[PDB]
A paper describes a structure:
Another fructokinase, FRK (EC 2.7.1.4), belongs to pfkB family of sugar kinase, catalyzes the phosphorylation of D-fructose to D-fructose-6-phosphate (F6P). Each monomer of VcFRK exhibits the typical ribokinase like fold consisting of a αβα three-layer sandwich domain and a lid domain. The flexible lid domain, which extends from the central β-sheet core, is formed by two pairs of antiparallel β-strands β2-β3 and β6-β7 and their connecting loops.
Upon fructose binding large lid domain of VcFRK moves towards αβα domain and traps the sugar. To check the essentiality of loop closure and opening, in fructose binding and F6P release respectively, a double mutant H108C/T261C-VcFRK (henceforth designated as “VcFRK-DM”) was designed. Hence, VcFRK-DM is expected to remain in closed form upon fructose binding and thus unable to re-open during F6P release. Under reducing condition, VcFRK-DM exhibit comparable kinase activity compared to that of wild type VcFRK implying that H108C/T261C mutations do not hamper the kinase activity. The O6′ atom of fructose that would be phosphorylated remains accessible in both the VcFRK-DM-fructose and VcFRK-fructose structures. Under oxidizing condition the disulfide bond formed between C108–C261, that tethers large lid domain with the αβα domain, would hinder the release of F6P from the active site. Therefore, our results suggest that closing and reopening of the lid during fructose binding or F6P release is essential for fructokinase activity.
Author numbering:
A (entry chain A), B (entry chain A): 14 to 323
């Protein structure tokens, strides 16, 4: 027959990450979780497309140029006439949520409109993170996009990727995020995120707490220990090569990029061997992404990833 | 008798200027026009104090640490619980307003409150720029501070320092700025600013247009040609050494710093010889400030300034 490379849509925040380098200097690094995933998929020769809003400013034009250079489809990237592109300062002493300071609140992406959503098609993927749910109108626009992708027979990937300070009403984060968890085909958590969102003290408890959601695939990253893969009535650990991280920025998005790339090119992404293989790629991408400063810098192509996987 | 070094109060925006340096890098430079003037006065061994608002964030704490290191009194620098410190990207191909992109709108300084204003005393100075007038509540708070300084028998310095993009209602800029021009003892313009604000095509026309304001001292900077000094029924050019600029960022604030330092230590700042001498210092400071990247970096001490003046 013929191969079927499905398009992956990414939406949310494209951001400039200011990363200390020699510091009284910052590296000007392209970033923003869904932009990172888009570039990760494209670098692996996948088919990714971004829709959303950046600012009509140099940082916004920098992110548009970056995504375009990386062969990400940006036909549906919009430039807001008023609001500025997200600008984030990174603390290299931390990893994850604790490492980021958001200087632009609310940034242009928070003003995502219904009209920004492109036509979706059966079999396509949509990936979203929680910053897209942080404030209106992006929150309601993003939930509408999710419902539309489900309706047309596409698939939904959700990575909470929690950044509480972005929420003008942080008391709304837990419920809003769990509503999106309830819409997804694929959900990726860090260990801490799963426990926080479900109010549990163990991964096992956390998984039992969302069993009612009947999620096809839940993946819980375990840092160096790889990832727990949860499918209906089944859990297993998939572990890869451990590396000493130089810059953890973007590791989780790289992980999601490898995962979604392999799901997107699969005959049937629900196939258990397909999923386990996709997580092996995800682990490899996550490790490699830490080897250079910047979320996107070390996102691997297939030659590099295969060489690393052995 | 005894010398009388008057305190100069500065209020408005303290900002982090991101200046290309090796660029895919930015230099992280302390800045913001009234913060620049405060540091310029302190470096010349004057008595400067800052009141206003920065964000409760690393950039805000960086500016507090900077002003403190520079011996600027920061007892009245406040940290806003919600809004972020102003962050500005600099274009080295431009000078003045055209070189700055404001990423944080509205930044913490725009939320200056009546309670942020310190007690003023007779003979003290207050210096303000137009960003403090850009939006509420800072606009009304700053006009209140101005009226209070006038009432107690202090002096008011105003440097429009126009940055239109900071105004949520830019159609209000001209009238709002000219209202402040009408309150000042000392006003400093660039040539372009004077003509723009008065809607005239020459400096001479611009000066005639504000004659009705009965301003004690108007200074119009002329780039390398020095400055025009306008006092009642009198104008003269004061020119100093021309330098080849390396980074024009902060030149105008350095100029104001030298000017206000010498006015602040004078027996009678209205004295014409005093004023002309103060402008000679101002010119020297303006030139020296261009010799390094960053608004504050090359603000001179007296040893450097005297050596440059000859
Ligand atoms: N030292 C490390 N060695 C190998 N892989 C790592 C390492 N750190 C992170 N990763 C990889 O990248 C993924 C992301 O790691 P993680 O710390 O859980 O990021 P996040 O909390 O954002 O999900 C891991 O699942 C793992 O596959
Ligand atoms: N090439 C230059 N050579 C000497 N002095 C300069 C030079 N450029 C700027 N200055 C000094 O610094 C001041 C500020 O210059 P200017 O270009 O008018 O800045 P601004 O437009 O912000 O007021 C000048 O009045 C002048 O005294
Ligand atoms: O996941 C890493 C990414 O997440 C963010 O914090 C927000 O989207 C970015 O600053 C960073 O590149
Ligand atoms: O006058 C120079 C200063 O003016 C600003 O643009 C705003 O206050 C700063 O970015 C800069 O340091
Ligand atoms: Ca993450
Ligand atoms: Ca100026
Ligand atoms: K990295
Ligand atoms: K400079």
């Amino acid at each position: 027959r013929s191969d079927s490379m499905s398009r992956v849509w990414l939406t949310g925040d494209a951001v400039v990450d200011l990363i200390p380098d020699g510091q009284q200097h910052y590296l000007k690094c392209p970033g923003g979780a869904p932009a990172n995933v888009a570039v990760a998929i494209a670098r692996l020769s996948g088919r990714s497309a971004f829709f959303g809003r950046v600012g009509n400013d140099p940082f916004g034009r920098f992110m548009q140029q970056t995504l375009t250079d990386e062969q990400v489809d940006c036909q549906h990237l919009h430039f807001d006439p008023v609001h500025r592109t997200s600008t984030v300062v990174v603390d290299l002493d931390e990893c994850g949520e604790r490492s980021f300071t958001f200087m632009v609140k609310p940034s242009a992406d928070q003003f995502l409109q219904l009209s920004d959503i492109p036509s979706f098609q059966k079999g396509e993927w949509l990936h979203v993170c929680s910053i897209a749910l942080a404030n209106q109108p992006s929150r309601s626009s993003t939930f509408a996009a999710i419902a539309q992708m489900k309706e047309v027979g596409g698939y939904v990937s959700f990575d909470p990727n929690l950044r509480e300070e972005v929420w003008s009403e942080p008391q709304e984060l837990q419920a809003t995020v769990m509503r999106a968890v309830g819409l997804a085909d694929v959900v990726k958590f860090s260990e801490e995120e799963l426990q926080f969102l479900t109010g549990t003290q163990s991964i096992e408890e956390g998984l039992q707490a969302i069993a009612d959601f009947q999620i096809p695939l839940v993946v819980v990253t375990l840092g160096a220990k790889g990832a727990l893969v949860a499918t209906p009535n089944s859990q297993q650990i998939v572990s890869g090569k451990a590396v000493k991280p130089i810059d953890c920025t973007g590791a989780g998005d790289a992980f999601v990029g490898g995962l979604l790339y392999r799901l997107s090119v699969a005959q049937d992404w629900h196939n258990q061997a397909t999923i386990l293989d996709a997580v092996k790629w995800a682990n490899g991408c996550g490790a490699l992404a830490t080897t250079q400063k910047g979320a996107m810098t070390a996102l691997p192509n297939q030659a590099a990833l295969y060489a690393f996987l052995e």
